[PDB]
Structure formats: structure tokens, C-alpha cells
């Protein structure tokens, strides 16, 4: 519902979505063979499925191909200072892909706008939607469209005849935030195939024991997971598959 979306939000009015109460894997996302921007700092793709955070956010805004690099925190420009500001200690990265098929018609696609004029530096993780008339002269502007009074929002020309660097790219940015609260969303763990009748070790949610796995004839009550004996040693464990 975020990637394969029917419509895409504007640059200034980027949609924010929070996902939780589930698990999220990045292996299928990596092997899609359609994303040309996956440079990430701080975390690693190999260790992304091991550690996790309290919550994961998602941001949706479509830009050109020249501004996908501008989303890095150490960047300046009309997008990196007036549209989206990323902190230096930001955890996560930016996912972008080519969207030549969509977000374009026969004529100029003027359905997307972005901020162009601002009197102050934007705060990190802040979105501004202002429809006030921008002023540059000393005389105040009472909402008129005269000299030194222009709309801050500038239209984007998403023509199909533009170059690769000017092609509109659909950009989805994930946000990783870890707090002291217990984690609600994490990564799914591995599920290796069991090996019976062989001296193997396992991690069955409560122990790390080495031994063969033999089929038994005693059945468990449907509320127990462990199993003891006379000598108080674990020798009967239920496989949750």
C-alpha cells in the first residue's frame, strides 16, 4: 500500500505511515532487481534482520532523479533544506526506483509541487505546508500577486522527453527509531529444516542441547512445550511446526 500505490504524495506534503505489531523482512525487498538506490549508513543489510527498533516509519514523496542524492543529511539545496531535512544521527536510508511508466502523461505533468522559497532553515523530520504569499520586498504583501510576491510552491515538469537525471523517481524513505520502550516490530528469524536421527544441536526456544531426534509414541497436552523426566532433564520438546 506504500510502494505499489495508485497515487503518490507531493514533495512538500509527503505522507507518513507507521507500521507496527508485525514482523518485517528485507530479503524479498533486496532481490526485487528494480531499485537503483540502496546506499545505507549506520546499519548493514546482513545485520538488518538481526537487530530491530521500537517502530518503523515510512515517507512517500516523488522527486526527479537529480534529487535522490539530495536526501542525504549532508546535502544542501531546494529539496534538502526546504522540503525534507534529515538529521545527522538518522538511522536508515533512502529507497528509490525508476518510475518512467507512471507519473507522466502526453503533456506536462504539473500535478506535483515542491517548496522553493523559505525564510528559515527547516527543522529535521519536519513537514511544512504553507499557502501564504512569499514576500521579498520591504513593503508587506497582502496576499496579492504583484512584484516581489510569488507563490512558494513551484510546479514540476515531468515530461517523458526529459533525461535520465530529470526523470521523476518514486522515492520511499524508511525511518528507524529505537527507544527504551519494548519493541513491537522486528525481523522474522530463520527457520532451518530439522534433521532427525543425527547428532545435532538445536535452539528450541528454551535450550541449546545436542542429541539425536527420535520419533516418540507419547503425545503432549495442547498447552505444554517442554518435557522432563525422573532425573529432571529435558528430553521431550514439541516442534511448533
Amino acid at each position, epitope marked *: 500500500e506504500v510502494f505499489n500505490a495508485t497515487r503518490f504524495a507531493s514533495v512538500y506534503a509527503w505522507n507518513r505511515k507507521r507500521i507496527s505489531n508485525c514482523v518485517a523482512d528485507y530479503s524479498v525487498l533486496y532481490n526485487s532487481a528494480s531499485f537503483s538506490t540502496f546506499k545505507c549508513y549506520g546499519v548493514s543489510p546482513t545485520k538488518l534482520n538481526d537487530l530491530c527498533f521500537t517502530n518503523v516509519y515510512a515517507d512517500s514523496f516523488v522527486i*526527479r532523479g*537529480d*534529487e535522490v542524492r*539530495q536526501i542525504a543529511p549532508g546535502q*544542501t*539545496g*531546494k*529539496i534538502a*533544506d*526546504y522540503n525534507y531535512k534529515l538529521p545527522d544521527d538518522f538511522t536508515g536510508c533512502v529507497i528509490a526506483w525508476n518510475s518512467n511508466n507512471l507519473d507522466s502523461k502526453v503533456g*506536462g505533468n504539473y500535478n506535483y509541487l515542491y517548496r*522553493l*522559497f*523559505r*525564510k*528559515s*532553515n527547516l527543522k529535521p523530520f519536519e513537514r511544512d505546508i504553507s499557502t501564504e504569499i512569499y*514576500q*521579498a*520586498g*520591504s513593503t508587506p504583501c497582502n496576499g496579492v500577486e504583484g*512584484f*516581489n510576491c*510569488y507563490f512558494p510552491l*513551484q510546479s514540476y*515538469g*515531468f*515530461q517523458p*522527453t*526529459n*533525461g*535520465v*537525471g*530529470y526523470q521523476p523517481y518514486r522515492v520511499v524513505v524508511l525511518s528507524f527509531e529505537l527507544l527504551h520502550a519494548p519493541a513491537t516490530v522486528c525481523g522474522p528469524k530463520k527457520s532451518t529444516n530439522l534433521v532427525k536421527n543425527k547428532c545435532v544441536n538445536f535452539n528450541f526456544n528454551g535450550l541449546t542441547g545436542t542429541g539425536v531426534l527420535t520419533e516418540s509414541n507419547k503425545k503432549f497436552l495442547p498447552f505444554q512445550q517442554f518435557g522432563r523426566d525422573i532425573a529432571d532433564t529435558t528430553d521431550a520438546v514439541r516442534d511448533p511446526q
Partner: antibody
Amino acid sequence: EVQLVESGGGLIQPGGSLRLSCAASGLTVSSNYMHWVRQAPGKGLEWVSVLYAGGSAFYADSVKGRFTISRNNSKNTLYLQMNSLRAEDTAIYYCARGLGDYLDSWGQGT
Amino acid sequence: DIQMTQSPSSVSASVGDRVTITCRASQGIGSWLAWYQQKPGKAPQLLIYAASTLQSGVPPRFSGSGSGTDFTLTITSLQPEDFASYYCQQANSVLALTFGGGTKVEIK
């Protein structure tokens, strides 16, 4: 109703430092874009640097170094500092202001 | 990355003629071209912007039409007052201006 005054140009050694001065009468320096366009004598126009409404500035590939922009809001003037110079720096300039993707106003040259 | 090349350099036309000045770009740019007129010894002045719109102070004798690659600055009537050079300027996402060559119009 837009007027820009430029000064500070003159004869100087390549191994020297000079300070340029661009002033606007009816415009402020901390709320609009400004382009530093240098035109070679007998050649076409060429972009060199740009200053945003915030505390961000950009430079071209050939003039990425040895350039510093520091606007002043007390006297409504624009300051540019050049620590070092080359033999190709002999050109005319017009300090000007403009919007995104284009500029309309211009100024004089020294 | 972007180079602005103009095919005409020196074209001579009479008063009742169209100068037909065109500008070319390596990469397609959609309706974000501006044209200027710089008199000798005088500061340049903007004539058209975004390849379609006209400035208030600029007389409506100038015109422009180009979608992505081929632009023009055809003038219906040539006046002796405006005899100067022209430049096609296209900016980037980082406000990196790109000024092309100058085309001069001379009296036959």
C-alpha cells in the same frame, strides 16, 4: 523598481585578496536567491556561484574552491571573498537576484 | 554534465524578417528555458522565461516554443532598437545555471 549597485572591481595581483560589494536598494539579501554570473570579455556568460535564502551556497566545478559568500543584513549588502586568483579570472560580473530555474533582474558591472 | 550549444552564431536579417534563433541541449529539459538580450556595454535583460511566458516589460513581439529539446526565439518583426546577443539558460536541481553561446544579429 529593482536596482543593484556593484563595486570593488579594479586592478589587483593574482596572488592577492580582494572583497567585492553588491548592494540592493529595494531588495533584501536574506529572503531570495542570488546568482554570481561572470562573463568573459568577448565570450558568453558563465555561471560561477549561487546563494540561497538560507545559510547554503553552491559553486560550479571549475570554481568549487577559493570562493566564500557571506551576506550582511545590517547594511543590506552582499560580500564575496577571493583568497586566490588565476589568469582566467579576468571577466565582467553583474550581481543579480532571481527565482528558481531563471532570473530576471540584473545589475551593473565593474 | 550539461552543455548548451547554439547552432546560429551570426545571422543577418532585414526589418521584415524572422531571425529564427534556436538552442540545443544534450539532455531534454521541459519548458525551463530563459532568453536574454545583452546590449554591448549594457547589462543583460530577461526577454522570456520558461520558454512560454512573457515578461510584463518585454514587448510581445518575442515568442518561444519548445517541448523538450528544440527551442526557438522567432520574432515577427525585427526592430533596430534591439540588436544584441542572445543566450539560452537552463538551471539544475542545485540552481546551477548553464549559459550557452551568444548569437548576434547584424544589419545586412
